Symmetry: C3
Subunit: 203 residues, 3 copies
């Protein structure tokens, strides 16, 4: 009676380890899917562009928006179009506008022009243009913040790029980092950066 | 003694299990999220798409010319690409502007019977398998609201809406509706069986 | 003592039930994951379908958008158009997204018939851009494909990873190995031929 309960417990302890082991593999697969989904939303949203702070208009149509876009380009980037779809999205502020361009080149060309100008205005009113990314990647850039700040202050010229890379000057050369772990390996090689981003990287 | 050495292993095992249960409901929440994402990214990608069902049965020019005959025979347009996928397969037609896709779809609906050379065909919207199933599951509830004068309506992706207290209410899924009618006596006993509550 | 064992009996017994339930629930999640993995495979194939992959193109520090496009034309002229985009990923692969999938197919068939693709003399490669899963599925047709080729079936692999050869004066398509297993069941001469490759 005491031995039967013992062997029963033993068998159970085995099932549990087996269940845990399987859970680990399962985990590793759910994580790969989450990353696959991230990469794909960024890939799809590649020719997209967010227009932020554009005055709403009583009864807007798809045609109205396209004209607005050209007004923006006219007012900001003269020297500089085909749209597959342009529309609002989907709190009391003007909704964003997604502009899916037919070509990715176009999306890039307008961001480059907007970054060189600094101030982008629509009828004097400063509007804002920015890439369209997946919530995941979007939250990845926001997590660079703390580190970005520290590098910013200490004149490292930090810079976040697609998808959510972090780049800055170290030895007269730009160093790109895909995640925090990659950066962790780099800081351990330079004493200066190591003690400067120690807490940030949570080492 | 021995019974105590055992009573300890079992307490630990109870803990291990509990731990495992919690990781279960977590991985499951994430699974649903991934499922709901795919559902969204499929719908998105198929935004400028239309399906041609029943077309007699290969190059890109003939299919485009075929499309023209359809528009000319039923709807008195920029095509990015058009191609095939006991019945001739479907023909996916990807337009240049989602708007142009929406125009021809709405024209196909308001006309009713769309035909090619006299033979009946169809121009369905291109949606994810998940969103489609969702739309036909509102069916039962939609009928009930239609009967009891609520003016029901299904929209993209698969949202149900109707008049409740003089206000339009939108519901992205049944679950959201279940949480809604639960506090509405009239609706609750009216859609109880429909919502499997 | 005696009452304690009596209280353990129930505890361990109940513990055994939880274990079983977990095994089942885990078994359902497993199914749901595969559906998601298979779905990710399919959605990637869809997106990457109008894409063409360039392998073995020397890098360049002054390389830009027009640089690549030019290089693509050089390849066309040396060995043999509307481009949605072209960009890099040992030289990085080049992903050429065409306007029409048809364009891609013309290119691929031309590279297959010519057999060898070179740039400025040095050899390169032109493969499809698909999901890892599909790329493997394609490679898994490998052995069987070669057997069909030796036996003059004139096999061919198409999107996604579909095998097609000529049998009974007609082209037969096979989406996977199991579909082929069902096909060869009623055809002894062919079964014998692929018995070991299909692992039957
Ligand atoms: Cl998953
Ligand atoms: Cl699990």
């Amino acid at each position: 009676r005491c031995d039967q309960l013992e062997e029963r417990v033993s068998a159970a302890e085995d099932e549990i380890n087996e269940i845990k082991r399987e859970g680990k593999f399962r985990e590793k697969r759910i994580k790969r899917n989450e990353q696959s989904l991230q990469e794909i939303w960024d890939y799809v949203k590649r020719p997209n562009l967010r227009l932020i702070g554009v005055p709403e208009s009583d009864v807007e149509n798809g045609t109205k928006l396209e004209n607005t876009l050209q007004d923006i380009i006219q007012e900001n980037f003269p020297n500089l179009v085909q749209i597959q779809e342009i529309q609002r999205t989907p709190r009391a502020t003007p909704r964003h506008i997604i502009v899916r361009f037919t070509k990715v080149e176009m999306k890039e060309k307008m961001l480059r022009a907007a970054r060189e100008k600094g101030r982008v205005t629509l009828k004097g009113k400063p509007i804002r243009l920015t890439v369209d990314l997946s919530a995941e990647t979007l939250q990845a850039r926001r997590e660079w913040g703390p580190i970005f700040n520290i590098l910013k202050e200490k004149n490292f010229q930090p810079r976040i790029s697609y998808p959510a890379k972090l780049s800055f000057i170290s030895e007269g050369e730009i160093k790109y980092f895909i995640d925090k772990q990659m950066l962790r390996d780099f800081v351990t090689t330079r004493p200066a950066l190591k003690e400067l981003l120690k807490e940030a990287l949570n080492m």
